[PDB]
Design an enzyme around this catalytic site. Structure first.
Site, short mmCIF file in Angstrom:
data_model
loop_
_atom_site.label_atom_id
_atom_site.label_comp_id
_atom_site.label_asym_id
_atom_site.label_seq_id
_atom_site.Cartn_x
_atom_site.Cartn_y
_atom_site.Cartn_z
N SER A 1 0.86 -1.20 0.00
CA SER A 1 0.00 0.00 0.00
C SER A 1 0.88 1.24 0.00
O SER A 1 2.03 1.20 0.46
CB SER A 1 -0.90 0.04 1.26
OG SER A 1 -1.57 1.29 1.41
N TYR B 1 -1.80 -0.25 10.44
CA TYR B 1 -1.89 -0.61 9.03
C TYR B 1 -0.63 -0.13 8.29
O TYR B 1 -0.05 -0.86 7.47
CB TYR B 1 -3.16 0.02 8.42
CG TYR B 1 -3.41 -0.34 6.96
CD1 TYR B 1 -3.93 -1.60 6.60
CD2 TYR B 1 -3.13 0.58 5.95
CE1 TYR B 1 -4.16 -1.93 5.24
CE2 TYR B 1 -3.36 0.27 4.60
CZ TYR B 1 -3.88 -0.98 4.26
OH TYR B 1 -4.08 -1.28 2.94
N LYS C 1 2.15 -2.38 6.29
CA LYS C 1 2.40 -2.27 4.87
C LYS C 1 3.88 -1.97 4.53
O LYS C 1 4.38 -2.45 3.51
CB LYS C 1 1.39 -1.35 4.19
CG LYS C 1 -0.06 -1.94 4.27
CD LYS C 1 -0.18 -3.29 3.52
CE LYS C 1 -1.63 -3.61 3.19
NZ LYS C 1 -1.68 -4.87 2.41
#
Ligand SMILES: [Mg+2]
Ligand SMILES: [Mg+2]
Lengths: 254, 247, 254, 247
Positions: D148, D163, D167
């Site tokens: 991402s 998150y 990533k």
């Protein structure tokens, strides 16, 4: 003068993984700069040497037993520090581990063990320190020990789990910096190259293979990290947050 | 021997280009406060009076040197003056830089080239001349370049594509030089500042710390890079930007 | 289907440095994908081979003499293209040069010569192409050939001026992407590793020293770049702008 | 032989985790359109019906596989099923990922760990299992991870520190695997999407192209990485984000 920007008089610093290597040298450095230093390690017996060297410069260390992977122990560490020192201004989230193992052969347990100390331990320590700093309302500074392994892939030793964990630490540092900036809590990472400490002693067979890869021609000494950790812990770094700082003898350039 | 001693510049001889204002001026003064003998360079010699007076004020004597860093003969002359008058050079800060605002679509070539010439070519000539003198001395040394967060991100809303290009170039030139000069124990590192109050209302909301920085907030880092404190660091870029580059 | 995203039928593409290596293979690829291709080089005689291979697949190339360092020639190139093809949808700013020279010994003239072609030539071409695209009002795609040299420092050959120029190209690409996005003109860079082409032929003495440094164990072939340049030139890359794409056999990982 | 032939997946056997919705589903369909036999995996087998029907619709037959990618025995079973039913594996897309929004200061450890477990550990187990099978086949292969732009920048205003951490980890794990698997001619690369419409009004102004992307705008790139078109690429991360990461 510029020199007074580096003074830690009146500051209270917590350093995890403080019994050896980088953490040990940094703890001594901070005491030399005038800080009250709490030193943490998985086994508090291991903190004797650092606590003695700290006494040696006229300070008194606060030794704390803490497995940074364990929320209850991290909680106990911060409570011990705020309880005895009144608070916390500086937090060095430094505890870290490594093993060597081909990715194809790596058990999940071993992958996870490295993540738990290297990433989760940093998260728990930084969060606990940050919460205490928010409550104080005085700002603060948080430093994480990442690695050049968060930027490049070491060869020939196979340390994919280590590389993964240190890239995580690098970016977690920035994520915390963004969220903590409104509180004037700065968060930065140091990314050392190969430093001759206890972390790498088991990998002595590799030293002679690493050296030609380092433009300065040698592994670093842990004393060569103190200036940078001092910089980040002090007012000298007042405008720096969300930065990673590589200190690697040139290794990441080629 | 303590950590604070690693930052002492006593007996060291430092050159700073673009020393007449902003970051260069604060860094010059900080190096003099730390014990260095300081050569300060600018294209207009009269502009160096303020910094030279400030250095006098902390008990240093600055060596003012007029130099256009884009001109190889003047750069050579700058190093000749400094070696001749101070005995040599241990620290060089290649700081002189310029900027203008112009949409890429409409940017004349002269304007594109003008920014590259000072920002990239001036850094190249200065670092090269300093490195040559350091090699000849045989004592190692430290070279510091001033890049910018503009070398990592693209400023908005102002259109400064040429400046951004020039600062990425400086960041990588610094690494290229570090690699070649490492055998000589000459370290080479870059500083990438964010917005430094040497548009304001548009920039502030973008900075996590909520303000532009002050040039005095760069002195600690330039001192770090110039002194023994940074002995294991070479080929590094250090961002100092209030968090700007994180989002 | 996903395959039709790569179709260049109806598109008009300009490729600089098109007489050899990467540019040549890319020109042929674009013609194979249905594009009308204008091919540029410092000497138009050198474009005979590529123009013939383009005829070989049933297209007709537009050969153009252009020294990309010269505004008057860049102007003439775009005018020739818009005049004969009606316009421009794709621009590959690919002309590039290299020499080997210790930084300490490097004349300013040599430093500058590499900047002029590698950075200034890209700027002039991209700007000219972008201006034509803005006028058309139809969006477009611009691709620059950077290099892994914009990310790492090659060793043992001394190419500091080359590294400087390619880092410049990488970031100029992003600067143009930001400014051109409102016009739906996408701008991206490709950063190849060591590719066996004419650019590196003079450096044959180094090939055997480079190979152990490349995880895939070999230099790339220029045909191994066509898929990526096709991707960036076509609708397949509709959401990508301001990206750099490394294609280097793993070289930048260690 | 032409450039377009480099993208053909005829005779190739592909595995896609998190294939039931969003990017994974579009990529599955695109791989089937390109000639691949496609195994589609998800934690809930009934959720795979939509993609399996879409693949039927272009004349493929999908192999649905129920798998929790966090569980080493289920991952092993997934690879066993695919090898057993399709004869082997040439392409793996380690795509399954999750997210929640929670201030770092208040984030329970369970929540931090939950996101690491699927996003990092699930990618590790899947890529590892696929790589083992590819090594045993002796034919090389290609592994693709979905990271991402969150691995390069920090999203705002939503707080997704866990998150972002996960990533960046995936981006670097991908490189670590590429290095170790290169001797086996198994390539490993990551895709880092921006905002993909699988808060909106706050994100759009931040995206230079002015819109979120559509998951169909990822298919070209995943096809590029899965096919011979990308034969010289390994250890690369490719951002596809409408320009988000530039400023
Ligand atoms: Mg490297
Ligand atoms: Mg940004």
């Amino acid at each position: 003068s510029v020199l007074d920007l580096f003074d830690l008089s009146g500051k209270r610093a917590l350093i995890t993984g403080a019994s050896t290597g980088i953490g040990k040298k940094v703890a001594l450095a901070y005491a030399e700069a005038g800080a009250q230093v709490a030193v943490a390690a998985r086994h508090s017996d291991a903190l004797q040497v650092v606590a003695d060297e700290i006494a040696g410069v006229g300070g008194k260390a606060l030794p704390i037993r803490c497995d940074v992977t364990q929320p209850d122990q991290v909680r106990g560490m911060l409570d011990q520090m705020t309880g005895e020192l009144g608070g916390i201004d500086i937090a060095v989230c430094n505890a870290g581990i490594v093993s060597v193992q081909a990715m194809l052969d790596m058990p999940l347990e071993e992958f996870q063990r490295i993540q738990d100390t290297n990433v989760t331990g940093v998260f728990l320590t930084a969060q606990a320190a940050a919460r205490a700093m928010v409550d104080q309302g005085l700002g603060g500074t948080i430093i994480t020990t990442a690695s050049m392994s968060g930027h490049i892939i070491n060869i020939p030793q196979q340390v994919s789990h280590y590389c993964t964990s240190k890239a995580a630490v690098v970016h977690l540092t920035k994520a915390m910096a963004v969220e903590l900036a409104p509180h004037q809590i700065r968060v930065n990472s140091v990314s050392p190259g190969y430093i001759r400490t206890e972390l790498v002693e088991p990998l002595a067979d590799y030293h002679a293979l690493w050296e030609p890869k380092i433009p300065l021609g040698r592994m670093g000494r842990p004393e060569e990290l103190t200036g940078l950790y001092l910089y980040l812990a002090s007012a000298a770094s007042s405008y720096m947050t969300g930065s990673d700082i590589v200190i690697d003898g040139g290794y990441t350039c080629p």
